[PDB]
Every structure is written in C-alpha cells, then in structure tokens.
Symmetry: D2
Subunit: 324 residues, 4 copies
C-alpha cells in the first residue's frame, strides 16, 4: 500500500460541539489527528497512514510564517523514500490560501492533498469522515502525481490555483466556476478530468526553504466611497505590496487612484484583482499597478508575497501572474 | 404605450473606444442618453420614452451622496401620474450597490429597472442595445409592478437584493447563485419566476426624503495575517460602521477580534459578512458584531448605512439584516 | 410542537449496503420509516412525529398510478386538524416528478416536504439524517405555509416546479440553475429567499382525487439522426401525449417533425421541451406542437398528463404550461 | 499571419429574420460564409481567412453521414501546409455532437474550432460577430495546438468532450459545470486554464476513413412509467446500440430492465448514461449494460457509434468510455 502521512493543522474537520445539531459556532481544531484517523479505520485499506500534528488551530488564524513552515515540512516529508504522499487537514476558511502557497513551493510530484470539512466531527451527517477517506485515496493513487496541489472535499478534486470557498456555510462551497474540478471521486473511483495549464510544484521558481517569513502584503476592498486613508495606513505600516479586491475588473475610483499613486511612490507593488469572485482582470495601461489575471484576492496576495521574495521588477511580477 | 423615463448615470452601456475590438479599458459614461435611445430605435415601439441625464460617470466613482440624490429623483418621478416606470442606465461595477440602495428607499410599486452593459456601445456584438430594449420592456409591463428594484442584463431579471457582479469581465457576470433570477426575457416575452421574500420599496421603513449625506461605513477584508491597524485607521476616521468581508462564515482572526472590540468600544457598529461570494453568515454569540445574513459586503454596507440613519441599536439593525 | 407525519415511500434515504464505503449500487427502500426516525431522534425535539409506511421502493420504479395514491393520501392527511404538515421520504431519481405531481394536486397550504438522500443510511458521512432533520424543521415552521411543494436536501429548499436532480451522483445534485432555491437551512435556522411566481396547490385546477389512472405520456429524445419510428411506436401504443426532450429550444429534425405530424394527425398532443437542462422553449408558429415554457422533460410530462385529465384543447394546455 | 479556413455548415450564426427584434424562430443557415466574413472584417487582421461552404443547414438536421464527410474534409484540410487551423460555423443545437465526433476522428494537433451564435446575424446585439472573431483568434494562436476539438462562444473556450448546450435560448448556454472551460478570451487575449485529461485527435484509434455511414444508435429516455415497447421498437429496427438517458445514475425501472435484457439478447450494446445533465454514472454489476462515465446522452451516442466501428466487445467499449 502507499505510505501516506496525514499532517494535521486544525479546522472544522477536527472540530467539535456540545451537540450533534450544532453545525456552526463550534470549536475548530479541537481533536487530534489520530482521533480523525481512528474515526475512519477504512483508510488503512487504502494506505499505510501515519498522523503528524503540525498545529491545531482555526484556519482564520493561519499565518504566512506558519504556512511557510508547513511547506518546508511537507518538502522534508516528500523527500523521504518512505513517503508516497501527504494529506493535510486544514480549516476551510483559508485553505485556498495555504494550498496555493504549497502549490507554488512544494518541490515534488508526489501528491499533496489538502482536505477539509464544513461540519464538525460531532455533527449529524458530518462530511469530514468521507472527505478524509477520499483525500487518502487521491493521495495514494499513482495517477495523482504531477497535478499540482489539490483540495479534496465533497467528492471533488480542485486545483489549489483555482478552487476557492464560494459559500459561507454549505457543504458544496468549494468550486472553481470557470475552471471546473481537476477530477471527482464517485463510487470509490477517481475520475480525472483536467490537468491545470499553469506552472506549479516541480516547475515553480518559488523556493522558500531558506526563508522564515514572507514580504508583507495587505488586501484593500473596492466599493462606492472607498477611502484613501486605508492606502495611507497600509503604506505607513510597511506593506511591500497591496492587493486590491476591486470593483469589477479591478476598476479604481479617484480616491483609490490617489492611494495607489502614493503606494507606488513608496516602492510598494500594487496588484489589481477583483471582488466579484471570478474572471480576468485585464491589462490597462491607463490604470496604476499590475493586474491579477484570474487570481482572486486571497490567491493574488499569496503569489505576490512569493513574487516579492524573488524580485521587485513589475514586469517580472506581472509575468508570474499570467503563468502561475 | 407606457411612459418610461430613461435616467442615465453613465457606465459601459454609454461607453466608447476608438475601435470595435476594444472591449476593456474603454471610456465609460461617454455617450449621452439620447444617443443610446437612438441606437436602439425599437424601444420607441415598446413605450413613450423620455431620456434624462442624471450624471455620466464610471460607476467606480459613484458615491453615496449621489446615489442618495438618484433615489430621491426616482421617487419624485414615480409620484407623477405621467410616469409608469423608470429605467436607470448605470455602470456594472457598482450597480448592485446603487440598485439595492433604491430597492430600500424608493416608495413606489412602479417598476425601477437598472440596466447596464459589459461591452462598450462601440464594440463588436455590444450587449447594451438588447439589454436596454429588455429593460424598457420590463419597466413597461404591468406584470412588473411591486417586485422590488430589478437589474436587467443578458436576458435576465435580477433582484437588487440578490444580484451581484460575479465575474470581472463576462457578459453573463450578473448572477444570484443561490437565489436565481426573478425572471428571464426570451423571444420578446417576460417569464417571471420568483417574487423576493423580503421587505422593499413600499414596505420599507427607510425614508430618505430630504437627506443630503449618509453615515460613513467602510469595508475591511478578512484573510491570513489580516492587520489590526486597518481597524484603528477606520475608527480614527470616524466611521459609523464597519462591514467585514470575512473569511468563511465571517470568521475572525485574533487580530480582527482585537480590532473589532476596539471599534465596538468606540460605538462603531460591526457587521460581519463574507468574502466567499454567497451564503449565510449565521449568528454566533461567541464572536463580536452582528451578522449579515445572506447579504454580501457591498449590499451589507448599503443596508448598514441606511440602518444607521434610523438607529444605532444593534438588535434593531440585526433584525433589518434578516428582513431586508 | 407541530404534528408532522413522515410518509415513507422508499429511496436511498432508506437504503442500505454491506459496507460503509459502498455509496453506489446499494439497496434502496430497505429500511422502515421508524428506523429512520429513531436513527435521528433529534427530529422529536422539532415536532411530534408519526411515521407511516406508504411504500418502500426505488424511485426509478415509482409509477403514476402510485403517485396518484400518494397525492390522495397526502390530501387526506392534510385535511385533518391534527396534522400540521407532511414530510415524504422518496428516492432521488424521480422525486422531481412525484414532487411536482403533488405540487399540482395537493389542495392545502400546509407544508408538503419531500426529502431524500444521495448516500445510503449505512454509508460514512450519510446525508440522510441531516436532510430529514431539515425537512421536519421546514414542514413544521409556520413560515413554510403556502409555498407549494418543496424538496429539502443538502441544506437547500427547492420548489417542486424548478428543482431537478442535475448530477448523477453528487450530494449537491439538486439545483434550479435559473430559479435558485426557495430558501436554505443553516445553523438550524430557515432563511426564505423566494416565493414561486406560479400557480400551485390551493390555487390549482388539477384535482384528481376521483381518479385511479392517468393519460399515457411518453418522452422521446431529440438528437442527430433521431428516428421517425419511435414516434410511430408511441402512437401505436396509445399515447395521449408526447413530450419531446428536444435539441436546443425544442428544435426538430426533418424526421422528428414527420413523427410529430403523424402524432398530431393521430390525435396525440405534442409538447416540445428541451434536453439541454434549463431555459425557455419559446412559442414558434412555424413548428408543430406546443412549447414547455421552462419545464424540463420530466416536469413537462407530469403537467401534460394532468392537463389531459381536464382537456384536449391545445390552447388551454398551452396556457397551463405558462402558468404552472 | 496564420492561415485559417472558415468551413461553414449553417446555424444561427448564419441565421436571418425580418426584424432585429426577432431572436427566435428565425431561419438558420440562410447566409453565406462570405457574408459572415464581410460583416466582421476584423478577422482579416488576425489571419488570412478563406471561407468554404460545406453546407447551410439548421444543426437539428445534421446527420452522421454528413458529419463523417465533415471530419474527412477537416482532416484533408489540416494535412495541408497552408492551413494552420480551421473554424467551423455550426448550429448550436447539435454542435456538441458534431464537435465531439471530430474530437475523436481528426488526426491533427492543429486547432479545430467550432463556433456558433445564439442570436441570428440580423438580431440586435447579435453575438455571432464577436464569437467568430474569438474563434479565429483561438484557431490561429500557437498556444492552441494539441488541445482537442474546441467550441468557442461567449468569450469561452470549451472542450468538445465536456461542453454542452445547457440552456435552450441564452447566450451563455454553453457550459461544462463540473469540468469548466479550457480557457477564456478577454480583451483580445487568450487565457488557457486547463488541458483535458482524456484521449483525443492524434491519440485516437477511431479511424473512419472509407466509412460512409455509422452503426445505428438510438437514445431512449428514463422516467416514471417508461415503456418497454420503445426498446422492442429499437431492436426491431436493427439498432447496434442504445444509449439510455437514465433516471439519476442510470437507474433502470423494471420495464427498462426487461427492455435492456431483450436488446442484449439480440446483441445490441446497451450504454447507461443520465438525463440529469452532469456527473458520473458508476459501474454496477447488478444492472444491465455499460456505464457512460461522465458522458451525457448526446456525447455517449457519438462515442458508442465510433466504438462500434472497432468492436462490439462490451469490455473494450467500456474502456473507451473511461478514456475518451
Ligand atoms: C467550520 C467550517 O469549516 C469552521 C472552520 C474554521 N473557521 C476554520 O477555518 O478552521
Ligand atoms: C465597462 C463594463 O461595465 C466598464 C464599466 C465601468 N467600470 C463602470 O462601472 O462604469
Ligand atoms: C441512491 C441515491 O438516491 C439511489 C436512489 C434510488 N435509485 C432511488 O431513486 O430510489
Ligand atoms: C439559433 C440559435 O443557435 C437556432 C439554431 C438552430 N436550431 C441550429 O441548430 O442550427
């Protein structure tokens, strides 16, 4: 059987509540990895699993420095001959962030599968058990290699570069409206549909094994009456980059333009993304800053942080955004 | 023929570029209302149209004080016996904000139909002509009365309370994933599907007659490493409310919590929404602030501003968010 | 507490397999209603539940004669003062057909909620328990009255007229792409979003309490090289109506039109629907037969079958399709 | 500039009506290929184009004998040094059938791009011009090679294997809900997202040179009370295969089982697909026939016909369905 390491970080999949009817406001990251494994013994028929407790927190508290350590640990594990793949339990709220980070930094073709759950382990009809089982099946399948980092949940396999939490509270929240899923798992069988046409993992230039932190990047929203002072505040607090979750295709108000101008004069890299949820923010030489291609705000921040560890050249960073 | 006033505010539907191939980075709010009307002569067959130039700007620059004037002007028009409905041309980027504002403040059952276009009027296969014709048809149909403010584009009729721009650059960007459309227009016939189960227009308590300004409300994003200083900044500039485009179901990091506690101490109303794009942010007594129900950040800000013109009582405001 | 009757008919929600990993090819309608109730005792805190075993079969074998009896029993149940609502367990495959039949034939405003499950009761992360809890919650809520027949599953409430199984094997299969959900259930709370703008239940003319059989209506597919002989066969077997799951907007090939014309000449009523999955089949005076509005083939057959119990008048039947 | 041949077959993109408001019931395949090119001269700045009138029909009348000739002509064309790609104008109703057929029979990596329109050329805001321009850009782009046959419309690039017409009459009808788009076209730039993970074109074993017709395959629908006599009829007319657009995951009623057994006894290959619209029909040893993987009925019929040109062995045909 394939040797799979289940690296636990917390989340609802490891969460609990006083009753089985409480599906919200529960405590995330309360249960240990072995408890998750023991809850679904069937996994042992899919692989020889080993649980490792990396952390146990609600993902809203996951930070770049910790995500950095997570990627470095996964790289250490994948370098071992006795490890064929890694399943990472993580809270749903920022899994797209953590997953995309490793998508760009893991130097291996071995499967790296993030798994999550929208209902706590104690809930009636909890989704975590089946999602974990599916994650291990995907991580241990020889056909899962070289596909980039994946996020498995609700019978779907999504690419870390496209998948995002689209709904605040539903089981089927993870979707990539325009890009679809890399594959699906039905009747204990994996059906691979797509291979992402972007750079990742073994073909990524982003290596952070020699770093302990990443350049600071904040996200500012775009909306009617958006304030200039928020740009002032970000600049003053030392951001290296600003991701703009803009109105429409990264459109900017006169106040947003003034704020971006100030940011650029201070050497801050401005990246225009969109608040809409999907789609392409196209180049526009008439507006300040760079454009995020199809990366949403959360994803754009991650790539910009990594881009900044390599260069400050806007043209190079822009190309990264069209290829990663 | 019904008497329909076409109130123009600008946008891509009135946008232009030097060539028919340029569909991005064009000049929004460039053409006059009579030019749009004459571009689609067919509207004159569906109604007695009167064009009125309210403004002509790109919607990223639409501001609350101007939206306020727009609502009062529309209210004024619909009180006239010689006006059966109004069609408001508006840029796509913030039409959901302006539309929901009128949805809550226009005290009339007569149709109020926002219309927009994703391609400039000069573009090959421009969508504005048909969108406008559809809008006029909807505004003039007596079966269109008492449905709340609507947004018409790409053969669909969306409720101001549910519809949102979900894609940065596509023609089919306006969708209400979980709520669907109020109706669709195919083959010059309107097919009404749903009636929104929420308070609006004639049943709304949000009277804004005579007002000239609105309570200041800003939006802060939720993501890994989100900074506390952004909350400090908002408070320092006297916001009356803060809408949080949070991770997942409005989950908050330890930094976000500290920032929210500070805001509450200063009497600022905190409203937790979601950055995901869809869904319910449920009540959670363990977290600070109020919850946005299914309102996304842009819509939540609008309702909060209007709520604050009547009260600062969190319980009353929260009820508004579950009923409007 | 409301008095809710759980009327069981079978399905995967009452399905069972030898292993917890077998989610496909299991035995549907294997467990009794009381076993379902005692398995999710939490329902007892939401209402006073009484189980009744109407049948126990796989929905692919549900027949019109039996659905007729189900409708009649439900009418009997709801006429009682000691019954506040009914939850009907049913297999997912044809629940949209049974649900829409009762949607048209139940003469009561009391809630009628069909519930189902995509994973057998014996599977890991089975969805049936939560779905049932949600269905009872909906059936017993005073706010649920007069909304038409509903289908509850995966935290969603769909109208029988719009909801359809859109995916062969996923938990989130039930959706109404263009019409959205009537409401959702999150955190043990119901959020009603829409009220269907169509005739149903207490406003329907489709009373069939005095019937034991229904007009025969078959469905024929539209595709390249579709054969004329299938129409000849249906006619020869006494069909009173033919529903065409046509290419695009009910478009017809030279062979299909010949088939339809033979059917019309033979006294059969022809209804042109679509195989696409969504949308409007508009009127077309150059094509034979009636058009299905936005009803898909499965729904179209149900309405046509019921229409035929009242009339053979094309114009009357057509108006039914635009109003129900 | 690249050399692109625009091979016209008809459709709404070549449709015409007396007025610009008539977008339904128009005459498809009424305009010549050169008329389409002259209406969008911008294409000539993207490539050296040559129009070729293969046919001018409504796609509901496209037949296998003709599709065979279309595939053979495209192979002939792409074998030429002076042809960099081919754009095929085709009606929307069966473009998914014709496109998937060529996807399996064209032995070249040069771009094969089907294009269509949902509004006639004479319609207000006709989509045909932009759709064609985008199709030409995709067909002439070096990055477009080796991606399988594509269908371009409404700024989206869909794979012939996944794309399908999901709505009867909307501009955004073409979607692959679970698989997404191969790419999108925004601001005159192509953004490639995925590469399908299936066999096609140059790696396909389906050699159809010399063939003038294909094995007969008909499609029968699954629904409550589905008739056994339709299977008898199909058998009587000598079908070599039957694609079942089944209830749910290809579930079969007692009548369907009886009819399938009769067909199997007669040597007919029975393929179980789904009427739902999306998803996997998983293998089930308890049911008759083969399963269609994620192929919908229309796509399944095409692959089954081609499968039968090589073998009647069920095991082999099943593998084709899991790999193409
Ligand atoms: C449960 C749903 O995933 C709550 C998740 C936490 N907020 C987390 O992100 O860990
Ligand atoms: C054209 C697409 O709507 C650009 C719109 C402007 N940004 C606006 O919102 O007015
Ligand atoms: C399990 C998924 O619902 C199988 C359902 C049966 N085919 C049925 O419809 O009862
Ligand atoms: C116009 C929309 O595509 C009508 C299409 C024809 N039915 C066709 O398929 O050619």
């Amino acid at each position: 059987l394939p040797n799979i390491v289940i690296l636990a970080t917390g989340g609802t999949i490891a969460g609990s509540a006083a009753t089985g009817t409480q599906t919200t406001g529960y405590k995330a990251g309360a249960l240990g990895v072995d408890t998750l494994i023991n809850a679904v013994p069937e996994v042992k028929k899919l692989a020889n699993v080993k649980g490792e407790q990396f952390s146990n927190m609600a993902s809203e508290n996951m930070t770049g420095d910790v995500v950095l350590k997570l990627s470095q640990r996964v790289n250490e594990l994948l370098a071992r001959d006795d490890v064929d793949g890694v399943v990472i339990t993580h809270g749903t709220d920022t899994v797209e962030e953590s997953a995309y980070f490793l998508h760009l930094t893991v130097k291996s073709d071995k499967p790296v599968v993030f798994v999550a759950a929208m209902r706590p382990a104690t809930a009636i009809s909890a989704d975590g058990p089946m999602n974990l089982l599916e994650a291990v099946r995907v991580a241990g399948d020889k056909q899962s290699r070289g596909r980039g980092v994946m996020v498995v949940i609700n019978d779907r396999i999504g690419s870390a570069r496209y998948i995002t939490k689209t709904n605040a509270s539903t089981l089927d929240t993870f979707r990539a409206n325009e890009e679809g899923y890399l594959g699906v798992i039905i009747g204990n069988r994996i059906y691979y549909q797509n291979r992402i046409d972007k750079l990742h993992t073994t073909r990524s230039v982003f290596d952070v094994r020699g770093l302990t932190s990443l350049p600071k990047v904040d996200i500012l929203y775009g909306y009617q009456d958006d304030p200039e002072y928020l740009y002032d505040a970000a600049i003053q607090h030392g951001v290296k980059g600003i991701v703009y979750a803009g109105m429409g295709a990264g459109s900017v108000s006169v106040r947003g333009i003034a704020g971006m101008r100030k940011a650029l004069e201070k050497g801050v890299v401005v990246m225009r993304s969109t608040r809409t949820g999907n789609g392409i923010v196209p180049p526009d030489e008439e507006l300040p800053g760079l454009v995020s291609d199809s990366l949403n705000p959360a994803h754009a921040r991650i790539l910009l942080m990594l881009a900044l560890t390599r260069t400050s050249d806007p043209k190079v960073i822009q190309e990264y955004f069209h290829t990663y």
